[PDB]
Design a binder for this molecule. Structure first.
Ligand code: HEM
Ligand SMILES: C[C@@H](c1ncncc1F)[C@](O)(Cn1cncn1)c1ccc(F)cc1F
Length: 456
């Protein structure tokens, strides 16, 4: 029954120039602040409706009426991730097949089995910071990415990236980032000329080969191994579908490996980085979290059971995900003609985009203090209405890695708070870099050891 707001248009380009910025999600949040709970965004040949209120998003999350959509971003990265779990349609046969095969790799029982290898990498992080000299500082997102990449490599695939042995990032992730940048930049401007893009397109082939060589090696080293593994790669290679009784095909396996290597570390690094940012900006909250870590983590290394008792650290992480969910949007399509919210008619196939940071600032849900960092909002999880808090997506297409991410992040943040005091020595000004995920660029701290020993 109502007509939808729309931001500024530019002739035949429609709204597209508004995203000529390196911070498009933050630009869309500002449009949502100006225009409200829903607005229409048009580009040449596509329309998207952006949702920001829990009132409308709770309906969008009704899986009888809306299914996951492959947004323009997911259609773009499908060039690399193929029909892996993140980039396949719900009704593409390999989605449910791979979901069925890999679900058991993300249970609590699987988490108990990953714990010792998560501790392996977390101890390496703590030892790096213990070994810094006087007046040296920490590049926070850089070291969080070292940890999370190593953790998914070791836990998932028994592969050691050995990121803490490197002063620059592992070539695999440099090659991935550079291949994606090149693929993006290429979508514009006189492409077959003298240099083209890659110094005549050679660097992309090299970067593609880096990624294919690593996938080759992860698979070959497993098959040649005379040790028993039971990890994510075991299920990828050998798990049979409970429905059809067949394993994943070889091509899809390659896509799942690169999907999980990337999905399994990037957003978790961003979460750890934002959580430490908010802690040093809210020293009362840091103190409360540090007291919990000291009281709970009484052993030289944490046990799985002790990580489960880091209740306040978990609330800290959820509140960082509330303010800056590091995968900040997900996309849905209308299965049939329908009316959203009693007021906005949709046609079959219409795209809805959930603007998660704005959902998480809905004052009718959280109160007027939405910009404050207050972990106590999560003291009682049953008090949060359904579909108010969605940093991991929705329904059967929600993040399969959610518990892995939160166990890793709770473990590591707990050990950080046990072993160091933290100083915001530069009075860092939050600068949020946007790729397909969010991170606090240039965030640096100093860590003063509490001199607490690590069986590390
Ligand atoms: C705090 C960290 C993380 C956040 C915020 C996050 C966020 C998300 C979101 C929002 C989705 C839904 C995407 C969509 O609807 O298009 C998703 C799906 C997915 N995530 Fe994550 N994720 C995190 C960590 C992880 C980890 C650690 C892994 C792997 C170990 C992972 C693997 C996946 C996969 C495979 C899917 C697709 C699930 C499916 O459709 O079957 N994510 N994640
Ligand atoms: C969105 C993000 C993600 N999704 C879900 N859980 C964690 C994440 F970290 C991402 O890593 C983004 N990304 C894309 N190319 C580089 N990075 C991603 C990973 C794999 C993928 F198949 C698609 C995809 F969008």
């Amino acid at each position: 029954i109502k007509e939808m707001p729309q931001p500024k248009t530019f002739g035949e380009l429609k709204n597209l120039p508004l995203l000529n910025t390196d911070k498009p999600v933050q630009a869309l949040m500002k449009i949502a602040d100006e225009l409200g709970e829903i607005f229409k965004f048009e580009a040449p040949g596509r329309v998207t409706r952006y949702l920001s209120s829990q009132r409308l998003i709770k309906e969008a999350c009704d899986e009888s009426r809306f299914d996951k959509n492959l947004s323009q971003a997911l259609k773009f990265v499908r060039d690399f991730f193929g029909d892996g779990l993140v980039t396949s349609w719900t009704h593409e046969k390999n989605w449910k097949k791979a979901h069925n095969i890999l679900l058991p790799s993300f249970s609590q029982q699987a988490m108990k089995g990953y714990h010792a290898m998560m501790v392996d990498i977390a101890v390496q992080l703590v030892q790096k910071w213990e070994r810094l000299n006087a007046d040296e500082h920490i590049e926070v997102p850089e070291d969080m990415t070292r940890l999370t990449l190593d953790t998914i490599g070791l836990c998932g695939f028994n592969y050691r990236f050995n990121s803490f042995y490197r002063d620059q990032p592992h070539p695999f992730i440099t090659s991935m980032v550079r291949a994606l940048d090149e693929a993006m930049n290429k979508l514009q401007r006189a492409n077959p000329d003298d240099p083209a893009y890659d110094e005549n397109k050679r660097q992309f082939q090299e970067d593609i080969k880096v990624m294919n060589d690593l996938v080759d090696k992860i698979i070959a080293d497993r098959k040649a191994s005379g040790e028993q593994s039971d990890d994510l790669l075991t299920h990828m290679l050998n798990g049979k579908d409970p429905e059809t009784g067949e394993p994943l095909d070889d091509e899809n396996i390659r896509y799942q490996i690169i999907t999980f290597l990337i999905a399994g570390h990037e957003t978790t690094s961003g979460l750890l980085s934002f959580a430490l940012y908010f802690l040093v900006k809210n020293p009362h909250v840091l103190q409360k979290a540090a007291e919990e870590a000291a009281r709970v983590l009484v052993d030289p290394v944490p046990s799985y059971k002790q990580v489960k008792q880091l209740k306040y650290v978990g609330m800290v992480l959820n509140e960082a995900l509330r303010l800056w969910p590091t995968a900040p949007a997900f996309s849905l399509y209308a299965k049939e003609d329908t009316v959203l919210g009693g007021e906005y008619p949709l046609e079959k196939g219409d795209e809805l985009m959930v603007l998660i940071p704005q959902l998480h600032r809905d004052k009718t849900i959280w109160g007027d203090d939405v910009e404050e960092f207050r972990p106590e909002r999560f003291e009682n999880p049953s008090a949060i209405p359904q579909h108010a808090f969605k940093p991991f997506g929705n329904g059967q297409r929600a993040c399969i890695g959610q518990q892995f991410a939160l166990h890793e992040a709770t473990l590591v943040l707990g050990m950080m708070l046990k072993h160091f005091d933290f100083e915001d020595h530069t009075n860092y000004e939050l600068d949020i870099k946007e790729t397909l995920t969010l991170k606090p660029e240039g965030f640096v701290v100093k860590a003063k050891s509490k001199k607490i020993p690590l069986g590390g």
